[PDB]
């Protein structure tokens, strides 16, 4: 499976308002993908988390979702 940073452009990890890119880092649920699946560095994951959590308060990214499977 590909990693998120691998198939992506040059993007601002600190921009909490770009949902199209930030959506790519959330799972089928509202959770944040671990570093194994994001391919991001340690520092890059720390930055992504807070900016994702920021967008969650503006209503741009979901807190949690519903799994349609099983």
């Amino acid at each position: 499976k590909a990693k998120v940073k691998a198939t992506l452009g040059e993007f601002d990890l600190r921009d909490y308002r770009n949902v199209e890119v930030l959506k790519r880092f959330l799972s089928e649920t509202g959770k944040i993908l671990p570093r194994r699946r994001t391919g991001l560095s340690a520092k890059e994951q720390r930055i992504l988390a807070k900016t994702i959590k920021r967008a969650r308060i503006l209503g741009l990214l979901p807190f949690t979702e519903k799994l349609v499977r099983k």
């Binding site: 940073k5 992506l8 452009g9 040059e10 993007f11 601002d12 990890l13 600190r14 921009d15 909490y16 308002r17 509202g30 991001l40 890059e44 930055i47 920021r54 969650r56 308060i57 503006l58 209503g59 741009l60 990214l61 979901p62 807190f63």
Partner: protein, 101 residues
Amino acid sequence: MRRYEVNIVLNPNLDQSQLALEKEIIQRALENYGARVEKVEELGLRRLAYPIAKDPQGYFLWYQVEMPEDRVNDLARELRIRDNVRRVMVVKSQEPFLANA
């Protein structure tokens, strides 16, 4: 004075009479706290990821301001007063950290 970004989400049911009022209200409050505005981005109607105040959408505003630091919380408190105002998040501006550069 430092440079902050003011995010504002309001009730997306307002006609022009109410929208202009709520906006010029924000203008008057920024003047009273001495916030010099640099640029502004009005996105408007947007699909929220979860219902906020039972409403599925929101009307968005973004300001880039330079204002005194000690007045930030008193400005945030002043914005959250209005009813149509729903979210107020004031963030210190930062350098645009790139990734996959």
